[PDB]
Amino acid sequence: TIFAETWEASEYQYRNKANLKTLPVNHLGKLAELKFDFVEYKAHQLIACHLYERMTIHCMNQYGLFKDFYRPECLDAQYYFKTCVELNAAYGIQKKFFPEHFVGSPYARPVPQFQQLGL
Amino acid sequence: TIFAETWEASEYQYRNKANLKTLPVNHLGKLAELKFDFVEYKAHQLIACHLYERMTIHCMNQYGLFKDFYRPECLDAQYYFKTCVELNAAYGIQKKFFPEHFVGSPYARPVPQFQQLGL
Amino acid sequence: TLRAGKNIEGSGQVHFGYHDQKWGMPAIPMFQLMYYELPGNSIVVNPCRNQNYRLYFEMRKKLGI
Amino acid sequence: FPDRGNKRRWFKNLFRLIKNPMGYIFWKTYKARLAKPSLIVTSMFIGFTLGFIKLKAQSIAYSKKQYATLRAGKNIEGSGQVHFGYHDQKWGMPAIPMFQLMYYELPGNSIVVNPCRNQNYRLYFEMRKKLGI
Amino acid sequence: YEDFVFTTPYFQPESTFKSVPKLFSDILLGGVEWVYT
Amino acid sequence: APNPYPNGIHFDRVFPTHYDPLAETNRTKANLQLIKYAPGNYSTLVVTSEKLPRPCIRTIQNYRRCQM
Amino acid sequence: TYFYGGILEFVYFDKSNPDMCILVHTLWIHLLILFLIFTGFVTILFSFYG
Amino acid sequence: ATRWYGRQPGHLLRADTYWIPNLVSQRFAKHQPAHWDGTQNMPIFRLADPKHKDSYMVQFR
Amino acid sequence: MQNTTNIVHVPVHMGHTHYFDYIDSFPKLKEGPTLEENHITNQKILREQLISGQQGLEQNLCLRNCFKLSQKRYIEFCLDRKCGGADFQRAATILGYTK
Ligand SMILES: CCCCCCCCCCCCCCCCCC(=O)OC[C@H](COP(=O)([O-])OCC(O)COP(=O)([O-])OC[C@@H](COC(=O)CCCCCCCCCCCCCCCCC)OC(=O)CCCCCCCCCCCCCCCCC)OC(=O)CCCCCCCCCCCCCCCCC
Ligand SMILES: CCCCCCCCCCCCCCCCCC(=O)OC[C@H](COP(=O)([O-])OCC(O)COP(=O)([O-])OC[C@@H](COC(=O)CCCCCCCCCCCCCCCCC)OC(=O)CCCCCCCCCCCCCCCCC)OC(=O)CCCCCCCCCCCCCCCCC
Ligand SMILES: CCCCCCCCCCCCCCCCCC(=O)OC[C@H](COP(=O)([O-])OCC(O)COP(=O)([O-])OC[C@@H](COC(=O)CCCCCCCCCCCCCCCCC)OC(=O)CCCCCCCCCCCCCCCCC)OC(=O)CCCCCCCCCCCCCCCCC
Ligand SMILES: CCCCCCCCCCCCCCCCCC(=O)OC[C@H](COP(=O)([O-])OCC(O)COP(=O)([O-])OC[C@@H](COC(=O)CCCCCCCCCCCCCCCCC)OC(=O)CCCCCCCCCCCCCCCCC)OC(=O)CCCCCCCCCCCCCCCCC
């Protein structure tokens, strides 16, 4: 689990495997696509996957779930939220049980003890 | 060291490296290119690198080392003999201290003990 | 092969390094009589699959059909 | 009978082309060169033709890079630098002024030995004085 | 445990509170190769 | 189809484009001479497992059975 | 090797020792080839004798 | 090991008439003496690395 | 390393033919009985099994289906609930799982 609003992008990249995905910050540009009026505090936009969640609620309040919520600005927020929490759950588990896979871990490429050098 | 006349080619091929050389048997065809008469017993032609040695001797007896030994049938025998013992010396050392590199060795891909499977 | 987990540098099958190449069949009768391209429609499911229908005939008689 | 006068005509033209290729080309293209295209078209033929040769020269240099890479211990499946997989490509400088002003190819003659090498000659001047030269 | 044996060496709980300072390390997707033309 | 989840992984062709998936709302189409995007426009990270051969499974079932 | 060397790796020792010969006449031939190329550029586009 | 040695950047001359900004700027540049500090790697020129701030215009292929 | 590299554990003999590369024979290959012979051989086993091996079968199938469970505590429950209070070791001997 991430106990902050920011995380080093490299700490979630693989060292001995091809990097085909990143763990980006929340896309703030999607917040300006909502045509309706809403109140959002800047203190909630950086934490992972939450901004997409609040936007989904705003869109589910202004519109519903039938024939009005089905507009591109609102469906992408629902998809980003459903997708953000799935990747973060997988990266979090991979960080818990496979920390040696990521850059920055000392077990990705273990540094030997001095007794292993034969001097 | 090889204590026989015949060896399995696969036993001298690498398992985890590209195979760019083989350890071939003596080239008996080169023995028919000597124009002069000579006595050779079939019991000495299979042992590694010895045929090229006897041919070199036969050529160094009929001819000498100056202006008459310099013919293709005699120089190829000297080059083969010198190269055969160098390759066999390196392969023999590699077989002595790096047997895990070759096919057929049980340490090239070790089979685990049943205690390591968790059953 | 890429989806299976093997990244690919370069392209094609003209292997620059230590690999066997397989050029296209020479379009001359000599090679057209010895070789022929693999017809995918000839790779089939083993007919032993049809022997599983024996279970159906037995269940039908067990249920009195 | 066939036309025996046309025998060995392809060879005879080859020997004239080798003897004087510019004269053989000049007279064989006189009637075609009576109609002269504009300066723009002539410049495009030359530019595209040379630009094609320039890329061919780079492709040869890259083939030598792959041979050195091969000898260094990396086997190579396929060939070329148009990576089908998950790699970055570099297509070659587009032969238009926009990229020709921002980019220029690496001149190997600009990679030099550090001039600090010349400071080892100080040892020689000091030795010559020590030996009384 | 439940009619199953999972052999493992003696666990050392002291490894939990092991001092592991995080060191900087950046990965650059897009960098330099070995040889260039 | 929704815009793919932002992914900074990309592959350059002619010049470094410095692709930023957070700079635009919708992802522009990939041009051959500009950029290639990462695979799996709509993909997630999961964990899978290869299924051992049937004959190998039967030997394990026989060992456990003969064990209890 | 134990103190100041690396791993003992097996390699194939190439006995052929290539070396590009640095010659004088090779550049003379090169100039002649380009001299023919430049003359054709002049013969086709900068020839006003006809 | 071969890759690591290959990243130690080589020395590339500053003199450049192929990039028109340097063709102009280097006419007003003052060549000052580079006093030897006792090393053999003094980077008194630019470096042959694609990521160098004075060589990024050079195409390394 | 060569892409078309395979390690084989049993002997094989390759054909020394021009333009072709394949395995023409296996050393010491014995030809078993024909499909028609194994068929007749099996019909005799299925016939005796059809006439003399059908009495007391419903009980053995319950024991076999019980022993295909994951845990032993469920097998015992399967035997006591479905097999009329059968014993673990007594049924394992009937099925042939005991040494
Ligand atoms: C037991 C021991 C001994 C066993 C021996 C066994 C072998 C027997 C040997 C005898 C074989 C010949 C049999 C007798 C032939 C009698 C027929 C006849 O009367 O003459 C017809 C023929 C008619 O020619 P023609 O009427 O004067 O005019 C030709 C046409 O007008 C055309 O003029 P054109 O200007 O329009 O040019 C077109 C030309 C073709 O022009 C071309 O463009 C081809 C150019 C090929 C050369 C380039 C190759 C590419 C690589 C090299 C690059 C060079 C670069 C040069 C430039 C610099 C770079 C820019 O057309 C031809 O190809 C003519 C060939 C003859 C026609 C037959 C049909 C051929 C079709 C398929 C041809 C495929 C091969 C072509 C090779 C041609 C070689 C000349 O004359 C001859 O062929 C004379 C041959 C004399 C040979 C003497 C040999 C004596 C025996 C010694 C042999 C020792 C060999 C040892 C070998 C050991 C094992 C390896
Ligand atoms: C589709 C295109 C595909 C591309 C194909 C490319 C084909 C290969 C071409 C490569 C080009 C090489 C460049 C050579 C530089 C020559 C400079 C020059 O000014 O030449 C005049 C020169 C004549 O001036 P000359 O020296 O006073 O000789 C007159 C004497 O009367 C001669 O005494 P003579 O009349 O009593 O003898 C009979 C006459 C007729 O003789 C023959 O034609 C039969 C002999 C042909 C043998 C096959 C030749 C194979 C290629 C050449 C040999 C290997 C490389 C030689 C290296 C040459 C460069 C130094 O001899 C000659 O015509 C001249 C002798 C030919 C050379 C033979 C000796 C070769 C060894 C010389 C070694 C000296 C250099 C030292 C080694 C350097 C190495 C670092 O011509 C030559 O000597 C040969 C030039 C051949 C060039 C062929 C170009 C064909 C067309 C290319 C495509 C361009 C198309 C453009 C279309 C544009 C449309 C708008
Ligand atoms: C190639 C075809 C497909 C292949 C199958 C071939 C089938 C067998 C046939 C093979 C032979 C085909 C012959 C083609 C050549 C033309 C034949 C001909 O002569 O007809 C009469 C023709 C007279 O032209 P005209 O149409 O009656 O009217 C002309 C009027 O002035 C004004 O007339 P206009 O106002 O009505 O129109 C203006 C202009 C029309 O404007 C243009 O032509 C546009 C030109 C733009 C530049 C294009 C550059 C060509 C591409 C080079 C790139 C390298 C190739 C690979 C990279 C490209 C990848 C696609 O006129 C022309 O240029 C006439 C030529 C147009 C048709 C041919 C153009 C071919 C373009 C390339 C085709 C694609 C290449 C595929 C190659 C694939 C290789 C794997 O002869 C000429 O004199 C013009 C030829 C062009 C040369 C211009 C002057 C060049 C001066 C350079 C001197 C450098 C000296 C170097 C000396 C070296 C040392 C020795
Ligand atoms: C007091 C008055 C001022 C005194 C003026 C004195 C002038 C003396 C003239 C002396 C003539 C020299 C005699 C020998 C010439 C032989 C060489 C030749 O090129 O003849 C071509 C010859 C005659 O061409 P043509 O087909 O009759 O067409 C001529 C005209 O275009 C007519 O045909 P058109 O009506 O259909 O053309 C319409 C025109 C329509 O054009 C327009 O309407 C407007 C054009 C505006 C252009 C906008 C420029 C934008 C630039 C943007 C730059 C961005 C990047 C910059 C990056 C810089 C770094 C930051 O568009 C064009 O096609 C123009 C042709 C290309 C001209 C290129 C040079 C333009 C600059 C002119 C500088 C002089 C300015 C004088 C001030 C005049 C003020 C009124 O044709 C041939 O193909 C045979 C020779 C081919 C050889 C090719 C090799 C070329 C390179 C070597 C040549 C020899 C050395 C260099 C000589 C200089 C050449 C540029």
Helix/strand/coil (H/E/C) assignment for every residue in D29-44 = CHHHHCCCCCHHHHHH
C-alpha B31: how far from its chain's center? 16
- Would you tell me how many other CB atoms lie within 10 Å of the CB of residue F41? 13
Rounded Cα–Cα distance for residues H3 and E35 (Å): 9
- DSSP annotation of I2: -
- What kind and span of H or E run contains B116? none
Rounded Cα–Cα distance for residues A29 and A32 (Å): 6
Supply the angle between the helices D21-28 and G25-45 in degrees, to the nearest 10: 20
* Angle subtended at Cα D40 by Cα D37 and Cα D43, rounded to the nearest 5 degrees: 95
**Could you give the dihedral angle defined by the CA atoms of residues H1, H3, H9 and H10, in that order, rounded to the nearest 10 degrees?**
90
- Would you tell me how many other CB atoms lie within 10 Å of the CB of residue A96? 9
Rounded Cα–Cα distance for residues D57 and D96 (Å): 18
Interchain proximity D86–F33, CB inside 8 Å: no
- What kind and span of H or E run contains C57? helix C53-62
Tell whether F20 is within 8 A of chain E (Cβ): no
- What kind and span of H or E run contains I57? helix I57-66
- DSSP annotation of C5: T
- DSSP annotation of B14: B
Rounded Cα–Cα distance for residues I69 and I82 (Å): 13
- What kind and span of H or E run contains C20? none
Residues A112, A106 contacting (CB under 8 angstroms): no
What would you report as the CA-atom Rg of chain B, rounded to the nearest whole angstrom? 20
Cβ partners under 8 Å of residue A115, min gap 6: none
From the list A89, A36, A87, A88, the residue with the least C-alpha distance to A58 is A36
Q: How far is CA F59 from CA B117, F62, I10, in A?
A: 13, 5, 22
Rounded Cα–Cα distance for residues H59 and F12 (Å): 14
* Angle subtended at Cα B51 by Cα B50 and Cα B52, rounded to the nearest 5 degrees: 90
Rounded Cα–Cα distance for residues I60 and I91 (Å): 9
Tell me the backbone φ, ψ of residue D75, rounded to 5 degrees. -70, 150
- Would you tell me how many other CB atoms lie within 10 Å of the CB of residue B34? 17
Task: Write down which chains contact chain C via at least 3 CB pairs under 8 A.
Answer: D, I
Q: Is the dihedral of CA B104, B107, B109, B112 positive or negative?
A: positive
Rounded Cα–Cα distance for residues D89 and F32 (Å): 11
Burial of C56 (0-12, 13-18, 19+ CB in 10 A): exposed
Pairing state between β H11-12 and D111-112? antiparallel
**Helix, strand or coil for residue F12?**
strand
Rounded Cα–Cα distance for residues H47 and H54 (Å): 8
**Six-digit token pair at G13?**
């020792």
**Six-digit token pair at G38?**
């430049």
Q: How far is CA A26 from CA A59, C32, I38, I86, in A?
A: 17, 61, 69, 63
Rounded Cα–Cα distance for residues F46 and A89 (Å): 10
From the list F14, D75, B20, I2, the residue with the least C-alpha distance to C9 is D75
**Could you give the dihedral angle defined by the CA atoms of residues I62, I63, I65 and I69, in that order, rounded to the nearest 10 degrees?**
140
CA D17 to centroid of ligand 1, rounded, Å: 21
Q: How far is CA C37 from CA C31, C33, C40, I87, in A?
A: 11, 11, 9, 62
Strand partners, F11: F36
Residues A21, A91 contacting (CB under 8 angstroms): no
Pairing state between β F35-37 and F10-12? antiparallel
Q: What is the DSSP string of I11-55?
A: --EE---TT---EEE-TT------HHHHHHHHHHHHHHHHHHS-T
Rounded Cα–Cα distance for residues A24 and A9 (Å): 7
Supply the angle between the helices I72-82 and I88-95 in degrees, to the nearest 10: 90
Residues C26, D101 contacting (CB under 8 angstroms): no
CA D23 to centroid of ligand 3, rounded, Å: 20
Rounded Cα–Cα distance for residues A36 and A45 (Å): 18
**Six-digit token pair at F56?**
């190998």
Residues B88, B23 contacting (CB under 8 angstroms): yes
- Would you tell me how many other CB atoms lie within 10 Å of the CB of residue A9? 15
Q: Give, rounded to a whole angstrom, the gap between the first and last alpha carbons of chain C.
A: 50
CA E1 to centroid of ligand 4, rounded, Å: 93
Is chain F adjacent to chain D, meaning 3+ CB pairs within 8 angstroms? yes
From the list A111, B10, B60, the residue with the least C-alpha distance to I6 is B10
Residues B101, B16 contacting (CB under 8 angstroms): yes
- What kind and span of H or E run contains F36? strand F35-37
- Would you tell me how many other CB atoms lie within 10 Å of the CB of residue A8? 14
Rounded Cα–Cα distance for residues G8 and B115 (Å): 34
Rounded Cα–Cα distance for residues D82 and D90 (Å): 8
- DSSP annotation of E12: -
If one residue of D1, D4, D8 were mutated to test the ligand 1 pocket, choosing by the most ligand atoms within 8 A of its CB, it would be D8
- What kind and span of H or E run contains I99? none
- Would you tell me how many other CB atoms lie within 10 Å of the CB of residue G42? 10
- Would you tell me how many other CB atoms lie within 10 Å of the CB of residue B115? 8
Q: Is G34 in the pocket of ligand 2 (CB under 6 A)?
A: no
Nearest CA in chain A to E25: A104
CA G20 to centroid of ligand 2, rounded, Å: 24
C-alpha F55: how far from its chain's center? 31
**Six-digit token pair at I78?**
């399967």
From the list D117, D75, D99, the residue with the least C-alpha distance to H19 is D99
**Could you give the dihedral angle defined by the CA atoms of residues E13, E17, E19 and E21, in that order, rounded to the nearest 10 degrees?**
120
Strand partners, A102: A14
Q: How far is CA D95 from CA D107, H15, H22, I27, in A?
A: 18, 24, 21, 64
Residues I22, I14 contacting (CB under 8 angstroms): yes
**Six-digit token pair at E27?**
């990965």
Residues E27, A19 contacting (CB under 8 angstroms): yes
Rounded Cα–Cα distance for residues A97 and G1 (Å): 39
Q: How far is CA H8 from CA F35, H11, H48, in A?
A: 30, 10, 9
**Helix, strand or coil for residue H53?**
coil
From the list B52, B38, B37, B62, the residue with the least C-alpha distance to B82 is B52
Rounded Cα–Cα distance for residues I61 and I45 (Å): 19
Long-range contacts of B112-116 (CB under 8 A, 24+ apart): B115/E7
Strand partners, H12: D111, H46
Q: Is G32 in the pocket of ligand 2 (CB under 6 A)?
A: yes
- DSSP annotation of F53: P
**Six-digit token pair at F54?**
């049937």
Residues H11, D111 contacting (CB under 8 angstroms): yes
Helix/strand/coil (H/E/C) assignment for every residue in D85-132 = CCCCCCCCCCCCHHHHHHCEECCHHHEECCHHHHHHHHHHHHHHHHCC
Helix/strand/coil (H/E/C) assignment for every residue in chain G = CCCCCCCCCCCCCCCCCCCCCCCCHHHHHHHHHHHHHHHHHHHHHCCCCC
Helix/strand/coil (H/E/C) assignment for every residue in chain A = CCCCCCCCHHHHCECCCCCCCCCCCCCHHHHHHCCCCCCCCHHHCCCCCHHHHHHHHHHHHHCCCCCCCCCHHHHHHHHHHHHHHHHHHHHHHHHHHCHHHECCCCCCCCCCCHHHCCC
**Helix, strand or coil for residue I92?**
helix
Rounded Cα–Cα distance for residues D131 and H48 (Å): 42
Rounded Cα–Cα distance for residues D117 and H14 (Å): 18
What would you report as the CA-atom Rg of chain E, rounded to the nearest whole angstrom? 22
Residues of F at the D interface (Cβ-Cβ below 8 Å)?
11-15, 33, 38-39
Rounded Cα–Cα distance for residues H25 and H16 (Å): 10
Chain B CB contacts of G16 under 8 Å are: none
Q: Which residue has the tokens 């350890």?
A: B23
Rounded Cα–Cα distance for residues B67 and I11 (Å): 51
Q: How far is CA A66 from CA A31, A57, H54, I4, I31, in A?
A: 22, 15, 58, 57, 71
Chain E CB contacts of D72 under 8 Å are: 34
Burial of I3 (0-12, 13-18, 19+ CB in 10 A): exposed
Determination technique for this PDB entry?
cryo-EM
**Helix, strand or coil for residue B39?**
coil
Long-range contacts of B84-91 (CB under 8 A, 24+ apart): B84/B48, B84/B49, B84/B52, B85/B49, B87/B21, B87/B23, B88/B2, B88/B23, B88/B48, B88/B49, B90/G10, B91/B12, B91/B23
Amino acid at F53: P
From the list A10, A84, A22, the residue with the least C-alpha distance to A52 is A84
Supply the angle between the helices D21-28 and D9-19 in degrees, to the nearest 10: 120
- Would you tell me how many other CB atoms lie within 10 Å of the CB of residue H56? 14
Rounded Cα–Cα distance for residues A15 and A102 (Å): 5
Residue burial D83-117, b: 16+ Cβ < 10 Å; e: rest = bbbbbebbebbeeeeeeeeebbebeeebeeebebe
Chain C CB contacts of I2 under 8 Å are: 18-20
**Six-digit token pair at D7?**
């025998």
Is chain E adjacent to chain H, meaning 3+ CB pairs within 8 angstroms? yes
Half-sphere exposure of I9 (CA within 13 A, CB side): 2
C-alpha I27: how far from its chain's center? 26
Pairing state between β I23-25 and H46-47? unpaired
